[PDB]
């Protein structure tokens, strides 16, 4: 008048809630004349009209009735007749730990960049529990891992929530994935728990610059190398992923004489020629090469292209004389013509042998390495032979050898 | 025998190179009988056959003749007749500073990320100079800038090259571009210089996490809110650029009861409803909201959606009686029926006025706020009126008010 009992949830049917008749001043001597009965649209309790006992009639699930409410009370009216009267009854439904905690998904992915500093904190999804009180108060535990630990905090209402903490730096180059296990154990009786797996995927950062396989790429190519030919191929390695690893090669500090001669592929890094090499013009090229990635990390190496000499220049003859005139009475040994040979090549390709083709009354006398004198060696008479067509030949010592001829007409005078 | 002169380049035509006749033992008394002349395919010098002077015949450009060679020598043969003889002459061509330095392009762009540490070094393109010696030895100067300075180094051959150095950190959020000026001055006489402009473009880094405009978005909506209605809109601001600024919003630590009720757009961040709100079930929702960017920076806020009560539940009447029986000789005031009203709403929407419709020999007597007793108030006789159809009405105090009726038949007994 009124009265309030208190029973745990999930009791079997027919469990004694109370002695409503005894507790409300009734006597068994008038248990039937009064005809007590319960009145409620929910068939949760029934009054035994023989002895007056309030009993459980159906399943009383506190989670379905009150949910997350801190208190669970069921209010109804027991009505009696002769005389008619209402008797308000309230029954408190205590919570039992009959529900385990749960996570939203069994496996959760978490993207964390390798630039995360030691001590960085990342939010973790908390567990849910339809119970109340200590039966839903959770305790979180992370399985031991060399890189990640767990800190546990509490909200302003006392409920716990976990956070992942980084205690050792990450390196996608070393380990791109970490598999963690999280467990939630409630504080009810008995203890109930659940587990979820966290796949930490290490997001790539551009912490690795390109690295050339060599700080110097040296090669020797002949000067008669056709245009478009491959000469060498540089190579840079980037340990990072995606755009952080795409490398673009380019020449640096290059001149127009080399810009019109060589080409470096931006992607493949293969060096080729686009013009004609000439040993007589330049015998070596030192070129700086730069490699860049997506994050603008740079690396620098050098390329030395040495050019070897080829015998692609024929010897040259230059002649002089006294207006191509010779007096017929000239003494033996008189200078008649001057010979000057020259070859643009080097080594034995540039060495010159100069000789006289024919059977003339003349003779070549060598003065220096590249200077000769055509001198008279025989008789002369304008009446018999008025002029001589003297042919001088020059041949280098290359492989294959090259040669050239030059013929001068020498007139005989009286 | 031989002889080697030395003249600067770019001399006017007719400039005296030397006195070849005097220097080679010749005398003017036989200047004509000898007929000295120069022999070379390049028309660079001519011998005056009157006095024997070697003179400049055409333009002698050392850059076109020898290029970048440290020394420039022109070797030719002066030939004399009567008697015929060769005379080797070498002429050293000195270099003058008649060429300015040059850069490949007037404006150069350079991408540098704002993560560049103080002291970082970046390669700069060196200037080119077709001169040699000190006339091509360059000196680089950077115009004063608060963020960038310049260091000057030298290769193993003594040639200088510049490098840009960062002395103050970069912040694309503060200044995305820096305009620098580079000048190269050679060491010749007179000094020649050239300028190039360097547009440093600051590459964006994800150094700015998202920032919510509010740490709490509170709003009050009625329970009869139709599904699909907009309730609020969160907002996060990211100062960075591109993917580093694209923000994705999502709920965190959400349950299935709320997952089936609310929806948060990943792009617009607009919160809407997808189910039906019921004040009788839950009057408030506190939801955690997460905002992420491309670099996985995170921000967290909260959203509180309060639900206000609406009068959408009609009052309910529950009746009891002694098998719907009344004895005709019952005394005035006898309990005949029990009335139990209840309303699920709150406030005045839940307050109940219970009244009797009709002119019966009965009367409602209130016992508690929600319990009444139908009591006899008049005469009774089964021979005259054997039964009464008593209609009880209940009306709440909401706006608009709701009501309900329930009619019970009470039989009159002898
Ligand atoms: Ca339960
Ligand atoms: Ca429970
Ligand atoms: Ca539990
Ligand atoms: Ca790394
Ligand atoms: Ca990396
Ligand atoms: Ca990289
Ligand atoms: Ca050649
Ligand atoms: Ca050659
Ligand atoms: Ca040759
Ligand atoms: Ca010049
Ligand atoms: Ca010059
Ligand atoms: Ca110069
Ligand atoms: Ca910044
Ligand atoms: Ca930024
Ligand atoms: Ca950002
Ligand atoms: Ca409602
Ligand atoms: Ca309502
Ligand atoms: Ca109502
Ligand atoms: Cl009583
Ligand atoms: Cl070059
Ligand atoms: Cl002589
Ligand atoms: Cl929730
Ligand atoms: Na003769
Ligand atoms: Na009567």
Residue numbers in the entry:
A (entry chain A), B (entry chain A): 1 to 414
What text appears in the publication on this structure?
Protocadherins (Pcdhs) encompass about 70% of the cadherin superfamily in mammals, and are involved in cell adhesion in the nervous system of higher animals. Clustered Pcdhs, comprising the α, β, and γ subfamilies, mediate neuronal survival, self-avoidance and self/nonself discrimination, and promote dendritic arborization in neuronal cells. For example, Pcdh7 is involved in germ layer differentiation, and Pcdh1 and Pcdh8 mediate cell sorting and migration during gastrulation. Both clustered and non-clustered Pcdhs control these phenotypes through homophilic interactions of their extracellular cadherin (EC) repeat domains. Using sequence co-evolution analysis, we predicted intersubunit EC1-EC4 interactions, and proposed that clustered Pcdhs form extended antiparallel homodimers engaging EC1-4.
We determined the crystal structure of PcdhγB3 EC1-4, the first full antiparallel dimer for a γ isoform. Based on multi-angle light scattering (MALS), peak 1 was wide and polydisperse (~200–300 kDa). Peak 2 was monodisperse at 80 kDa – consistent with a dimer – and readily yielded a crystal structure. Although the asymmetric unit contains a single PcdhγB3 molecule, a crystallographic two-fold axis generates an antiparallel dimer with intersubunit EC1/EC4 and EC2/EC3 interactions. This dimer is consistent with the PcdhγA1 EC1-3 crystal structure, validating the previously predicted interface, and with recent α and β Pcdhs structures, confirming that this interaction mechanism is conserved among all clustered Pcdh subfamilies. As expected, each EC forms a seven-stranded Greek key β-sandwich motif, similarly to other clustered Pcdh structures. Notably, EC4 has a unique β-strand arrangement compared to EC1-EC3 and all known cadherin repeat structures. Third, the PcdhγB3 EC1/EC4 interface is much larger (BSA = 976 Å2 per protomer) than the EC2/EC3 interface (555 Å2 per protomer). In the PcdhγB3 EC1/EC4 interface, F86, one of the predicted affinity-driving residues from EC1, wedges into a cavity created by hydrophobic EC4 residues. A PcdhγB3 EC1-4 F86A mutant indeed disrupted dimerization, resulting in a monomeric protein as measured by MALS. Analogously, purified EC1-3 constructs failed to dimerize in vitro whereas EC1-4 constructs did, and K562 cells expressing ΔEC1 or ΔEC4-6 constructs did not aggregate while cells expressing chimeras in which EC1 and EC4 derived from different paralogs did. Together, these results indicate that the EC1/EC4 interaction is not strictly required for the specificity of dimerization but it drives dimerization affinity through non-specific hydrophobic interactions.
